[PDB]
Amino acid sequence: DEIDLSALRDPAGIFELVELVGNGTYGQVYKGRHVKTGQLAAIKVMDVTGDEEEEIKQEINMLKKYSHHRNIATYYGAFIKKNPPGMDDQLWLVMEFCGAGSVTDLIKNTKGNTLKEEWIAYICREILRGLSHLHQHKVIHRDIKGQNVLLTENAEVKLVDFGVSAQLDRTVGRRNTFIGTPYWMAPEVIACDENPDATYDFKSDLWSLGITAIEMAEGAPPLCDMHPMRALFLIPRNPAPRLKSKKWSKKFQSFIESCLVKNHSQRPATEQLMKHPFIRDQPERQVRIQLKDHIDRTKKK
Ligand SMILES: CC(C)n1cnc(-c2ccc(F)cc2)c1-c1nc(C(=O)Nc2ccc(N3CCN(C)CC3)cc2)c[nH]1
Ligand SMILES: [Mg+2]
């Protein structure tokens, strides 16, 4: 796990920045086009500062090792633009371009800001397959949310942004860093803010998945109205958030119930959530026509 950012080549005459599509923890993410081929790629540009140096090395290594997986946006390589001595250099991280954008963007471009149970089931399983791969390699994402779940032109689900992700040595290993997006953060993660003896593990990603499912169902996560600091206080003490409507199937209500167990000890693991009827029983690996058509309607207008 040794990266040198000196032997990296200049991106001039290879990739160019077309438009800004989003941002990722540290950096601004662009739609990059290859100068010759016209091949599209997601490119995160960020200043190589001493404060965010080891956190960028962490990301690259994690992407080099695990991004091959079909449910993780594939890392191609890195370039660097040299600013004059004393100034910070621009690091370019090139990656698979997810043409349809984020789950959050699909929600906003759907009637009543609510997705079908069958899309939520499909996406939730693809996220679980991505998380299962990561957790098996002692990885915690620690920032699972609609914004970090992207879709390709083929409506293939991809996890992105390993900027606040943890690499563990031992299987039973634990973390204590208060990090993530407040609305999606698990209670045992939020505990670490004030309590210095509090520790968490991979289970925290399965809570965030639970909130991401509610995000897809209702259009936004629980406590999205109030201030993040006003939300961080209630998550640990309030009862597990549920779906407002009862029109949702009993199996989908059961999946949110399984995901959002506040006590991480009683919470099911990744492999257990895969066997849950909501994940196991779906109409799969061919029939995603509705999604591919839904994003084609967005392309026109
Ligand atoms: C931003 C995301 C949270 N992110 C954080 N960090 C990295 C990243 C990028 C490159 C690397 F090498 C490493 C990390 C990434 C990352 N966004 C992508 C990506 O493809 N994003 C994308 C593409 C298209 C859209 N459109 C919006 C408008 N219309 C509806 C059409 C679609 C929106 C967003 C791929 N990776
Ligand atoms: Mg991949």
From Swiss-Prot:
Domain of life: Eukaryota
Chain positions found as Phosphothreonine: T177
Cellular localization per UniProt: Nucleus; Cytoplasm; Recycling endosome; Cytoplasm, Cytoskeleton
UniProt tissue specificity: Expressed ubiquitously. Highest levels observed in heart, brain and skeletal muscle. Expressed in normal colonic epithelia and colorectal cancer tissues.
Active site, per annotation: D143
Modification comment: Autophosphorylated. Autophosphorylation is activated by RAP2A and induces association to the cytoskeletal fraction.
Domain Protein kinase span(s) in chain numbering: 15-279
Extent of Basic and acidic residues compositional bias: 278-296
Residues engaged in binding ATP: V21, G22, N23, G24, T25, Y26, G27, Q28, V29, K44
Function: Serine/threonine kinase that acts as an essential activator of the Wnt signaling pathway. Recruited to promoters of Wnt target genes and required to activate their expression. May act by phosphorylating TCF4/TCF7L2. Appears to act upstream of the JUN N-terminal pathway. May play a role in the response to environmental stress. Part of a signaling complex composed of NEDD4, RAP2A and TNIK which regulates neuronal dendrite extension and arborization during development. More generally, it may play a role in cytoskeletal rearrangements and regulate cell spreading.
Family of the protein in this entry: Belongs to the protein kinase superfamily. STE Ser/Thr protein kinase family. STE20 subfamily.
Entry's disease: Intellectual developmental disorder, autosomal recessive 54: A disorder characterized by significantly below average general intellectual functioning associated with impairments in adaptive behavior and manifested during the developmental period. MRT54 patients manifest intellectual disability, delayed speech and hyperactivity.
Self-association and partners: Interacts (via the CNH domain) with RAP2A (GTP-bound form preferentially); the interaction is direct and required for the activation of TNIK by RAP2A. Interacts with NEDD4; recruits RAP2A to NEDD4. Interacts with TRAF2 and NCK. Interacts with TCF7L2/TCF4 and CTNNB1; the interaction is direct. Interacts with TANC1.
Record protein name field: TRAF2 and NCK-interacting protein kinase
Origin species: Homo sapiens (Human)
Gene: TNIK
Parent-protein start and end of this portion: 11 to 312 of 1360
